[PDB]
Structure formats: structure tokens, C-alpha cells
Amino acid sequence: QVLLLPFPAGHTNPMLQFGRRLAYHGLRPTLVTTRYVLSTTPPPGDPFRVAAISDGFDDASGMAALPDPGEYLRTLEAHGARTLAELLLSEARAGRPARVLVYDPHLPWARRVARAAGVATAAFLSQPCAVDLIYGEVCARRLALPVTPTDARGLYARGVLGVELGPDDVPPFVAAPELTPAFCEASIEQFAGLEDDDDVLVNSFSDLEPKEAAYMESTWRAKTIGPSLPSFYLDDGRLGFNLFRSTVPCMEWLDKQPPRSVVLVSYGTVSTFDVAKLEELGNGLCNSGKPFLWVVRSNEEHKLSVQLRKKCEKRGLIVPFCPQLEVLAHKATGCFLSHCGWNSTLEAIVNGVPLVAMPHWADQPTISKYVESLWGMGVRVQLDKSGILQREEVERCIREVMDGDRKEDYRRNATRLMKKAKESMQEGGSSDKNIAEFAAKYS
Numbered sequence: 067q068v069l070l071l072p073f074p075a076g077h078t079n080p081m082l083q084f085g086r087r088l089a090y091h092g093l094r095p096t097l098v099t100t101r102y103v104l105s106t107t108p109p110p111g112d113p114f115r116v117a118a119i120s121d122g123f124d125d126a127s128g129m130a131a132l133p134d135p136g137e138y139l140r141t142l143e144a145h146g147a148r149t150l151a152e153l154l155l156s157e158a159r160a161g162r163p164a165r166v167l168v169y170d171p172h173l174p175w176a177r178r179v180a181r182a183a184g185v186a187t188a189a190f191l192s193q194p195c196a197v198d199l200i201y202g203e204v205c206a207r208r209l210a211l212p213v214t215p216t217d218a219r220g221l222y223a224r225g226v227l228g229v230e231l232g233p234d235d236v237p238p239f240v241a242a243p244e245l246t247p248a249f250c251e252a253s254i255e256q257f258a259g260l261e262d263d264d265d266v267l268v269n270s271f272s273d274l275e276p277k278e279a280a281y282m283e284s285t286w287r288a289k290t291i292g293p294s295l296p297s298f299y300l301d302d303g304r305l306g307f308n309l310f311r312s313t314v315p316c317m318e319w320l321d322k323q324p325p326r327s328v329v330l331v332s333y334g335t336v337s338t339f340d341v342a343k344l345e346e347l348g349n350g351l352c353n354s355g356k357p358f359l360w361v362v363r364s365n366e367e368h369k370l371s372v373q374l375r376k377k378c379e380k381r382g383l384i385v386p387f388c389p390q391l392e393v394l395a396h397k398a399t400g401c402f403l404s405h406c407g408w409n410s411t412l413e414a415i416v417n418g419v420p421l422v423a424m425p426h427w428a429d430q431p432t433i434s435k436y437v438e439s440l441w442g443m444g445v446r447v448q449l450d451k452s453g454i455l456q457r458e459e460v461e462r463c464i465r466e467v468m469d470g471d472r473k474e475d476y477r478r479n480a481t482r483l484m485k486k487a488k489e490s491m492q493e494g495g496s497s498d499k500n501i502a503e504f505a506a507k508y509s
């Protein structure tokens with residue numbers, strides 16, 4: 067089998083989509099998740115098998131149980147490494163010895179476990195080459211902590227980054243590591259021992275990040291294999307209207323709105339917004355006058371007031387979750403106010419949707435700088451002198467992407483990069499070639 071081990075978390079999907087392409091080439095993929103996830107979510111179905119490891123919490127969410135990130139990661143290491151070793155053996159004794167383990171390098175222990183079982187290893191980077199190479203330069207002891215704008219400027223000048231990153235653009239996990247010690251460590255340790263792997267893969271495409279992808283290839287052997295999204299969305303027949311059309315209620319609401327009218331709004335599945343920040347965001351939405359689809363997760367929605375909910379009835383719809391790809395592909399969608407996590411960003415690119423970037427941390431500040439300055443596909447919200455996002459700024463940015471003098475600039479770039487994304491994943495494209503090379507290596 068090809069074992070697929072994402073970080074246990076929507077974001078099995080990029081690795082799953084990679085695994086679907088390997089199944090097209092005749093390989094046999096297995097999704098490896100936690101016992102808890104395997105008990106409490108439906109499996110992927112054909113062409114996947116499913117298997118499990120433990121993170122120490124088989125009957126409740128370990129992440130909820132251990133909200134301190136270092137504690138959660140040490141527990142997942144201890145239990146995960148034990149149980150992954152047991153799974154490699156049980157697999158072999160069942161007549162399915164693993165050919166290769168494709169794993170998220172936030173799990174380094176998984177590489178060591180697999181290699182000690184004699185199983186080939188393929189790291190799967192799920193963040194942009196621009197961010198990954200900065201973490202790798204710190205891992206390789208070419209940059210000290212903290213990483214500064216001066217350090218990023220050198221990388222720019224040397225042709226490795228394609229844009230000059232300022233203070234609000236460098237990755238905070240290394241530019242302000244004291245804020246998030248575990249996340250600093252996890253981001254750097256991704257790279258420690260990556261040179262031992264058989265393969266290194268990244269969910270990006272070369273045309274998007276050319277200098278950064280070329281440096282990741284030459285430095286870390288990283289091969290671009292994305293955007294790792296469903297083939298439908300990439301216009302790839304091998305096997306405007308969406309033939310993959312669901313029955314989700316929010317989609318029915320979208321069908322009633324005019325073309326390119328709707329603002330999709332999401333800050334993803336991990337960040338939390340306090341009542342004050344929800345209020346700024348929501349009132350900005352309403353003040354814009356645009357139709358909007360606002361994703362407010364079930365675990366966050368207690369923070370929404372009655373009155374702000376009611377204000378959003380006029381032109382908006384609030385949902386706990388949406389089929390984000392299907393939304394972004396819909397003809398009514400005019401822009402995406404996103405935290406600019408990488409998955410959301412790639413989904414916006416593949417659909418040619420302009421962005422309003424509202425980053426928090428992780429990869430999002432850096433991505434947001436690329437969206438506004440290199441890619442040209444949107445704008446970034448400007449925080450006040452106290453670091454607060456104001457309703458007026460939410461509104462301004464929405465209006466500036468939908469109505470401003472540069473409206474066509476952001477759409478033109480979005481559409482340009484859409485086409486290049488689709489090219490990369492179609493037959494003979496830069497990312498398809500690397501997928502086919504890997505499939506043949508493990509056949």
C-alpha cells in the first residue's frame with residue numbers, strides 16, 4: 067500500500083487528492099488517521115482503505131483534552147509512534163506491507179518509525195514554498211532566531227524569494243517565536259532529517275512561486291504536486307456550471323444571487339475570534355451592502371449576538387460550514403474574505419476568485435503579502451495602530467476588490483493564476499509530471 071498520514075485534523079484532503087492520483091496510476095492508498103477520527107467520521111471510500119493509530123485519546127478528541135500544543139504534540143508522538151510501528155507490522159502480517167509512507171513532516175517521528183521498519187518515506191508539505199524555505203533556512207542553521215526582515219531581504223536579493231517581506235509579512239512562528247514556542251519548534255523540525263527521506267513533495271505549483279519552488283527543489287529535493295484538489299476543479303478529464311453539484315442549503319441561497327455578487331467569508335477551522343473581533347467583521351460585512359456567505363463555526367457561534375445575526379439577515383447567510391470549493395466555483399461568488407490559510411488560498415486560485423486577506427499567523431501573513439504584491443489577486447486588511455481590525459477597514463477592502471479602480475486588476479490576476487494552476491495539474495503539467503514520476507517509482 068501507499069500509506070497517507072496527514073496531521074490528525076477538512077485537511078486530509080490535499081493528501082487524499084494526491085492519493086487519488088496515485089490510485090489512477092494503479093497504486094493502493096490507505097488513509098491513516100487516529101482511532102478517534104476513524105470511529106467518529108465517515109471513511110473516504112474507494113479507492114482508499116483506512117487504518118488507524120492512536121494519539122492517546124481513542125474515545126474523545128485529544129486536542130480538546132490537551133489544548134496546550136506542546137503537550138498535545140508530545141502525547142501524539144508517544145502514542146502515535148508506538149501505534150504506527152504496530153500498524154506497519156500488522157499491515158505486513160495482513161499481506162499489505164507498506165511500500166511508502168507519505169506523511170506530514172510536523173510528525174517527524176513518523177519518518178523515523180517508518181524507516182526503522184524499512185518503509186520508504188515521502189514528506190508532504192502542505193504550506194507554500196515561500197514559508198517552507200524560511201523555516202528550512204533556520205533548520206539548516208543558515209539563519210538564526212528570530213528571523214528578521216533583513217534576513218528576508220537577503221533571500222529576495224539572492225533570487226530565492228520573489229517578494230520583499232516586511233515585519234508584518236515574515237512568518238511569525240520564526241519572526242516572533244516567543245509568542246508560540248511549540249509552533250516555532252514544530253515549524254523548524256519539519257526539516258530536521260528531511261534529507262533522509264526518499265521523496266519530498268509540496269502542495270504548490272511552480273508558476274505560482276517560481277523562485278521559491280526552484281530553491282525548494284535544489285535545497286530539499288521538494289517536488290511540486292499541486293494544487294492537490296479534485297480533478298473536476300482543475301478541468302482534468304482523465305478518469306462555468308459545476309457538474310459536482312450538491313444539495314447543501316447554502317448552495318440554494320447562492321443560486322438566487324446575481325453573478326459575481328457574493329462575498330464568501332471564512333477564517334478557517336483553527337483560529338478563534340473574540341466577540342469584539344466578530345462584531346467588527348460582521349458589521350463590516352453588513353456595512354458593505356453586498357450579499358455575503360459568512361462561515362461562523364459551530365464552536366464559535368455562541369459569540370454572535372442576536373442583534374448581529376439579525377443585521378446579517380438582510381443580505382447575508384451565516385452557516386457553520388460550507389462546501390467551500392463548490393462555493394468558490396459558483397457563478398454568484400465575487401470575492402473571498404479569507405484568513406489566507408494555504409488550502410483556502412489555493413482553492414481561491416483554482417476558481418479565479420479575488421481575495422480580501424485577513425491573516426492571523428502561521429503561513430497566512432506571508433501568503434497575504436504574496437496575494438497583494440506579487441500575485442496581485444486581492445488586498446490585505448490594514449490593522450490600526452493597536453493591531454485591531456476595524457469594521458470600516460473590512461468594508462473598505464470589500465468595496466475595493468468589488469468596486470474599486472483596481473477591481474479588474476485583481477480579477478485579471480486571479481484568472482491568470484487559475485489557468486496556470488489548471489495547466490500544472492493537467493497532463494504534462496509541471497505538477498502532474500512529478501506525480502507521475504512518484505507513481506512510477508512506487509509501482
Ligand SMILES: O=c1ccn([C@@H]2O[C@H](COP(=O)(O)OP(=O)(O)O)[C@@H](O)[C@H]2O)c(=O)[nH]1
Nearest residue numbers: 076334335336361387388390407408409410
Ligand atoms: O466552511 C468551511 C471552512 C473550511 N473548509 C475547508 O477547510 C480548509 C481550511 O484550510 P486552510 O489551510 O485554509 O486553513 P485552516 O483551517 O488550516 O486555518 C479548506 O480546505 C477549506 O476548503 C470547508 O470546506 N468549509
